[PDB]
Amino acid sequence: GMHSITENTSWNKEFSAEAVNGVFVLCKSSSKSCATNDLARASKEYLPASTFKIPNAIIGLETGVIKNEHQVFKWDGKPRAMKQWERDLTLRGAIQVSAVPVFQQIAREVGEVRMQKYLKKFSYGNQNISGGIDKFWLEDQLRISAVNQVEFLESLYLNKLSASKENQLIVKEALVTEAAPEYLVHSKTGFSGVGTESNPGVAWWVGWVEKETEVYFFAFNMDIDNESKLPLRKSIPTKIMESEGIIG
């Protein structure tokens, strides 16, 4: 509830320029002041892909599966699907390089019962974790909208998720992607893949920006059927936020 959202089709400019079907949701201060290029798509649910590392990390910490912020996730030396992952990682490292196999093992250890419990507590999308504990967020039935991502991140920002404050803080530091004296960005990407014939994949960028004493929450997604379009998931939102005087 209490979300107040205004459609502003002038933001479509950055999408049509690139022939992208997508949505940006941007909120100033709180979910009581949000704008989007597309009201319908703002509420449409998509696979979260690696944006699911945010709740997964919090759940891993809450359940004790992740011992504390200093746990090192060791590589067993066996092939992983991206070279970036073939190394020992911190929790922050694993989140920042989107190290799927690290979070797959976290998920397995959390287990279905506890995972379901926390997604209900977090109101995380359709809360559908069916299809395999180590892959549901990448290829099964879990879906969440940009609106819901914004409400979830706002809760995280405020430490109001149903988790310890210290666990929320740990995950928040892990999400910092830009730090300057008066400008701080927390963000996470996701990418489900290129989809299938007439069923595109989804790319995400979600997070929040603290500028001076203001805070802006954001969530972006787009249909994607070609990996070469992937950088648009950051550049389109960056341009919109620049046009609003934010990126700065």
Which of 4, 10, 16, 50 is catalytic? The answer is: 50
Q: CB of 210: closest distance to a copy of itself in angstroms?
A: 7
Please confirm, yes or no, whether 30 is among the known catalytic residues.
no
92 binds a copy of itself (CB under 8 A): yes
181 binds a copy of itself (CB under 8 A): yes
* Of the residues 16, 179, 197, 199, which one makes contact with a copy of itself according to CB under 8 A: 179
Which of 26/163 has CB closer to a copy of itself?
Answer: 163
Buried b (16+ CB within 10 A) or exposed e, 58-94: bbbbbbebbeebebebeeeeeebeeeebeeebebbbb
User: 76: which residues sit within 8 A by CB, 6+ positions away?
Assistant: none
User: Using CB under 8 A as the criterion, what x/- string covers residues 71-90 for binding a copy of itself?
Assistant: -x--------------xxxx
* Of the residues 44, 114, 172, 234, which one makes contact with a copy of itself according to CB under 8 A: 172
Q: CB of 31: closest distance to a copy of itself in angstroms?
A: 15
**CB-neighbour burial class of residue 231 (10 A; exposed 0-12, middle 13-18, buried 19+):** exposed
Q: Do β-strands 5-7 and 144-145 pair in parallel, antiparallel, or remain unpaired? A: unpaired
Instruction: Indicate the DSSP class of residue 141.
Output: S
Nearest to 221, CA basis, from 15, 3, 5, 8 = 15
Q: Do β-strands 214-224 and 201-211 pair in parallel, antiparallel, or remain unpaired? A: antiparallel
Binding-site size, a copy of itself (CB under 8 A): 29
For 33, the enclosing helix (H) or strand (E) is none
Interaxial angle between packed helices 100-122 and 53-62, expressed in degrees from 0 to 180 and rounded to the nearest 10:
80
158 binds a copy of itself (CB under 8 A): yes
* Of the residues 120, 169, 242, 248, which one makes contact with a copy of itself according to CB under 8 A: 169
* Of the residues 173, 231, 235, 243, which one makes contact with a copy of itself according to CB under 8 A: 173
User: Using CB under 8 A as the criterion, what x/- string covers residues 196-215 for binding a copy of itself?
Assistant: --------------x-xx--
* Of the residues 39, 97, 194, 247, which one makes contact with a copy of itself according to CB under 8 A: 97
17 binds a copy of itself (CB under 8 A): no
Q: Do β-strands 34-36 and 22-28 pair in parallel, antiparallel, or remain unpaired? A: antiparallel
Matching residue, tokens 């210290």: 166
**CB-neighbour burial class of residue 165 (10 A; exposed 0-12, middle 13-18, buried 19+):** exposed
Which of 213/228 has CB closer to a copy of itself?
Answer: 213
Please identify every residue annotated as catalytic. Answer: 50
**Footprint of a copy of itself on this chain (CB under 8 A)?**
70, 72, 87-90, 92-93, 96-97, 158, 164-166, 169-170, 172-173, 176-182, 184, 210, 212-213
